[PDB]
Design a protein around this ligand. Structure first.
Ligand code: NAP
Ligand code: NAP
Ligand code: NAP
Ligand code: NAP
Ligand code: AX7
Ligand code: AX7
Ligand code: AX7
Lengths: 250, 248, 248, 249
């Protein structure tokens, strides 16, 4: 029987490459998505062409609210429903936008989205994953720039910091259960769709290793390692995949 | 004219010591409290006896909700209404209790632990800055990289607070606002905790085999807000007696 | 044809496991040794039995001295000599013993502890880069932030090695040379260590209450040198079963 | 009676600022120096003109060598010789120059960069503690240790090792009531060899006031850490960098 993984925000970009690589490695996959319905269904189609009944989609808002626990419970449930097991959780889904300290969304909405997706939803999915429980592990998508934050990204940066906190806290507490918890921290990888070309090239010029962003596949490569038998004694570790970017002074 | 500080959760323990030392240095103080009204008022009365019209209290629940931004606005506004200025903000109030992964709902715990330790400090920072030797001190935790077992949300909250400290330090530097942290290891221990358990923690501390007094924590806050720290921002000063350096 | 790796301190324990795993992956190997000649040649015999002329031995003291730079140049040279190329350097060799602050001279201990753990890696890094999927992997230590009591020089050495890892990752990136680290917590316990003290450490490990095998450490090295780590430089992977997360 | 302090490389710049501030606080000082004899004697004269017999100079090379432990022991002995006690040690002296990976020999650069930044602090710490109330050591570190200057590997290795020492010694000497802490400047006084344009390039990166720390600003954090207001602080390294370390590439 093939193992199963949940990847959140798996319709596009890094999430999608993680889903594709897990599937290539022999995993059945739940493709979680929020708005990207066509892309997710299309990904599941592609993967199911390769091996039938090895991919399903699961829709959910990971914004924080009083029903977020139910939503997170359901994403894990959906893996058991489809595949009868859940071996790997990848916490990939992420809101990323500036929240300036000095001056359409209300600040509480920005808190719910940025802290919910980057931190609370991973926490709740971690609970649900562990509650429903071999090579079990969780990989959180972190950020190599957490200590050199983007200007005016306080809420986002707080979310990612809390994610590091969860990574270590869950590694420690789930170790008795044989669930490993690790992170992968991209620096610059696939740049924002809305980011302009001049900005994209400014960030690219900053990376010591090859003056370019990471491919989604290079990030996924690190996830694959962490879920594998070659990482069986590794828990609580966050692997930077940043081409040295975090080492460059101002 | 005397400067003015807001200290959150200032009725008891570390918060109280901070407020008292701030007052002794010459600050007028806003004493924020949640449930400890009698203590906050008794403190205000003591400080106003020392020098009249130098202390006020302000009640607010700092749990996250749609009304938290208004609450945080109002705490900052109360410093201006009382004293005409707000020079220092100390983010001290904190919920601290276990939240194992395997009567409060989990979302109430999220609201309380993330709210007090991170969201409220962020909102108060926005309000403090929007209203402007200005500085913010956040009360962090020296043990964030070796967390208490089954305290994931508390740990997430304190990690988020480090994030805020760094982000705000960077963003507010142009306005001349410094943002720093004090990270206690073990200080004032719970009242009801058995002496034998307190002693388990005390014996772990390399420096003197004892916990920090609240005054010792307050001392580092005093340094950070003073003219002797005028180039210091985004720094978190551990006040832990070497505890975080001790391996399991 | 086949890429080539230098493994320092490769005759025994974690170094041997790294060399074996590199060889199994397709590398030709230089097995460096200081005192363990019988074991190094024994490893080479086994590897060469598998594939002819794919393993050579190299003797050098990696204690700092006036001749260390020449010794380091010659270890790198011996890889080019044997195999015509040098793709991977693994800095594994390491002196480990206490140096209380309160019969080797202290300067000998400095030479051995800082030399094996930091200066030689620096010199080998220099020679490796001078002679040029290229990478260096440094064997670091997950317990650098909570060090063993009375191990200041050793701890200073492993700290400098982190510094070298980062410095060299930055400076060598334009040459396409990646520089990374693997930080064991407790793996193969020292041969000198008593049995009850071994079990004391094992009991501390959250993931399995056991030390890492040498092979499990090697697995992380193998990942870092592979095409699966092509964007990774300046990274130090902890392989510690959660040990560094455990408060005192 | 007044406490005594040893400050290494104290003839000028930051080390001088630290010994002056320690002096103004009530300390008798040992002004350690290597090549800056004129400046050290000038400083001791000023401080002695302020309060008679409250400053002595002490010459020593802090380059690593087989005699370095004896030199470091002698720096500590000189404090006890002048003042009868030694309460505070500040490890400030520092060699700082590039060592690219690709007419000093490399082993001289090791000896100077690792010697001054790490080995001497370590030997001075041994001697300080061996010779032994508010006792402490302050190590002058570097806030940019994780975003190092390009081609400064040995310097960086030395400042990393100094962090290791701060933490190791803090742990080991806590039982003796010796606190061990650090102060980490980003950009403070720029090198005298730096032209104004390069200075300003660095100045413009500092979020807080777009300027370098004064020598006094660094000394302020040293003074705090040696004081009674820091009596529970050990193994801490206070960044005094105006937010520099927080700024991405
Ligand atoms: N790309 C980089 O350079 C970089 C750098 C540092 C860190 N990272 C981290 O690495 C991970 C992957 O990066 P990425 O750039 O691929 O991410 P991304 O495109 O910005 O976001 C990934 C997915 O997150 C989902 N998402 C956003 N808000 C959500 C919500 N409220 N509820 C549920 N899902 C939500 C979206 O799903 P739908 O499209 O289905 O709506 C989106 O496709 C993220 O955690 C990111 O923070 C990336
Ligand atoms: N004590 C330690 O050993 C230690 C260790 C590490 C870090 N710290 C940190 O240092 C700071 C001070 O510590 P402490 O032990 O003195 O604090 P504490 O007693 O645990 O809490 C301080 C105050 O926080 C306030 N608070 C709790 N929930 C609140 C809510 N929902 N809304 C508004 N206020 C709320 C309470 O005010 P009311 O009483 O008025 O309700 C409480 O008195 C805290 O940030 C703590 O996390 C302390
Ligand atoms: N074992 C662990 O639990 C653990 C924990 C944390 C970090 N680490 C790190 O992981 C790496 C491997 O650990 P290990 O326990 O396998 O190491 P080890 O057995 O203590 O040492 C490995 C080899 O280093 C060589 N070496 C020692 N002094 C030398 C000198 N002066 N010159 C040249 N070579 C010298 C020796 O080679 P010869 O036998 O040929 O003389 C020795 O066999 C080391 O870097 C270590 O610090 C290990
Ligand atoms: N200035 C900065 O922006 C900056 C930034 C980061 C960190 N720091 C750290 O803060 C401290 C003070 O900085 P600084 O710029 O004032 O220092 P510095 O001027 O570069 O050096 C201070 C003193 O170190 C002494 N020194 C150098 N080599 C020596 C040797 N081989 N033996 C004995 N003494 C030697 C010199 O003494 P003599 O003149 O008597 O020969 C020199 O005056 C240093 O540890 C530095 O690394 C400074
Ligand atoms: N999450 C995230 N962090 C980023 C930093 C730089 C560019 C794109 C990014 N996306
Ligand atoms: N180098 C090194 N560091 C160690 C820590 C614990 C046990 C064995 C070890 N070997
Ligand atoms: N020691 C030291 N570190 C420095 C970093 C930037 C500019 C000058 C410096 N001097």
């Amino acid at each position: 029987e093939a193992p199963a993984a949940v990847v959140t925000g798996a319709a596009k970009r890094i999430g999608r490459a993680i889903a594709v690589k897990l599937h290539q490695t022999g995993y059945r996959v739940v493709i979680h998505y929020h708005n990207s319905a066509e892309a997710a269904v299309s990904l599941a189609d592609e993967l199911n062409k390769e091996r039938s009944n090895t991919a399903v989609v699961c829709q959910a808002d990971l914004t924080n609210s009083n029903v977020l626990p139910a939503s997170c419970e359901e994403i894990i449930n959906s893996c058991f429903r489809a595949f009868g097991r859940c071996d790997v959780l990848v916490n990939n889904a992420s809101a990323f936008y500036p929240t300036p300290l000095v001056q359409g969304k209300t600040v509480e909405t920005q808190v719910a989205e940025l802290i919910g997706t980057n931190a609370i939803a991973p926490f709740l999915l971690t609970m649900s994953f562990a509650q429903r429980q071999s090579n079990l592990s969780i990989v959180n998508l972190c950020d190599a720039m957490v200590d050199q934050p983007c200007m005016a990204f306080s809420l986002y940066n707080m979310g990612k910091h809390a994610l590091v906190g969860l990574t270590q806290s869950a590694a420690l507490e789930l170790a008795p259960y044989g669930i490993r918890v690790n992170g992968v921290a991209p620096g610059v990888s696939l740049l924002p769709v809305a980011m302009g070309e001049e900005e994209k090239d400014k960030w690219r010029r900053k990376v010591p290793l090859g003056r370019r962003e990471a491919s989604a596949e290079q990030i996924a490569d690190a996830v694959i390692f962490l879920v594998s038998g070659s990482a069986q004694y590794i828990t609580g570790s966050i692997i930077k995949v940043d081409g040295g970017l975090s080492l460059v002074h101002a």
